[PDB]
Amino acid sequence: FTEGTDYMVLEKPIPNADKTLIKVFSYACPFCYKYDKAVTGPVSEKVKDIVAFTPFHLETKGEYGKQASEVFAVLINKDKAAGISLFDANSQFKKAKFAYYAAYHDKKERWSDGKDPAAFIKTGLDAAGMSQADFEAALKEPAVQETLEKWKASYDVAKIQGVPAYVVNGKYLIYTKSIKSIDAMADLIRELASK
Ligand SMILES: [Cl-]
Ligand SMILES: [Cl-]
Ligand SMILES: [Cl-]
Ligand SMILES: [Cl-]
Ligand SMILES: [Cl-]
Ligand SMILES: [Cl-]
Ligand SMILES: [Cl-]
């Protein structure tokens, strides 16, 4: 694999990202949906022995970027605390993520274009099986707030080649357009993780 073609080196790395595969994404991004249907799960499963799969949501995209970040931060922290993989059938994050992708991209739902955040939140929480009250309580927790703080770094990473942005060890950003297969992507991630 070749620097400049398959990947690039971030001039400002994502901090505290040792042994991670970070995926910067947005619920509102059609390619994020496409790659999450086709490559994200299989590839992350293949490399789970070397790098921890670590979604980073980009809060600045779409009318409900902030709300989606809140829902995802809450659900990822809950899944992690329960020792549940983010690709597991029982992952609440996974359920919410695909509910938003289906609503936004397949059904063209826009929840009144920013003016109905309660409806947007409901879509994700209902799919995840979480109550509004539980979400509101969980959002106040330090770990959830820490996650939201970490994800602020998504904006500067997204500038390079858009979203999705798959990053190895906070340093090596894969060029999404170069990804040709599950195997090749997993091969690349392993090479990058050995650097
Ligand atoms: Cl779109
Ligand atoms: Cl994800
Ligand atoms: Cl759409
Ligand atoms: Cl609605
Ligand atoms: Cl819109
Ligand atoms: Cl900036
Ligand atoms: Cl091979």
Curated annotation (Swiss-Prot):
Pfam families attached to this UniProt entry: DSBA (PF01323)
Disulfide bonds: C29-C32
Induction of synthesis: Expressed from a tri-cistronic operon that encodes AssT, DsbI and DsbL.
Occurrences of domain Thioredoxin (ranges): 1-194
Annotated keywords: Disulfide bond, Periplasm, Redox-active center, Signal
GO molecular function annotations of the record: protein-disulfide reductase activity
Compartments (UniProt record): Periplasm
Superkingdom of origin: Bacteria
Stored InterPro entries: DSBA-like_thioredoxin_dom (IPR001853), DsbA/DsbL (IPR023205), DsbL (IPR028588), Thiol_disulfide_DsbA (IPR050824), Thioredoxin-like_sf (IPR036249), Thioredoxin_domain (IPR013766)
GO cellular component: periplasmic space
Gene3D superfamilies cross-referenced by the UniProt entry: Glutaredoxin (3.40.30.10)
PANTHER family, alphabetized: THIOL:DISULFIDE INTERCHANGE PROTEIN DSBA (PTHR35891), THIOL:DISULFIDE INTERCHANGE PROTEIN DSBL (PTHR35891:SF3)
Function: Involved in disulfide-bond formation. Acts by transferring its disulfide bond to other proteins. Part of a redox system composed of DsbI and DsbL that mediates formation of an essential disulfide bond in AssT.
Family of the protein in this entry: Belongs to the thioredoxin family. DsbL subfamily.
Subunit structure: Interacts with DsbI.
Protein name from the UniProt record: Thiol:disulfide interchange protein DsbL
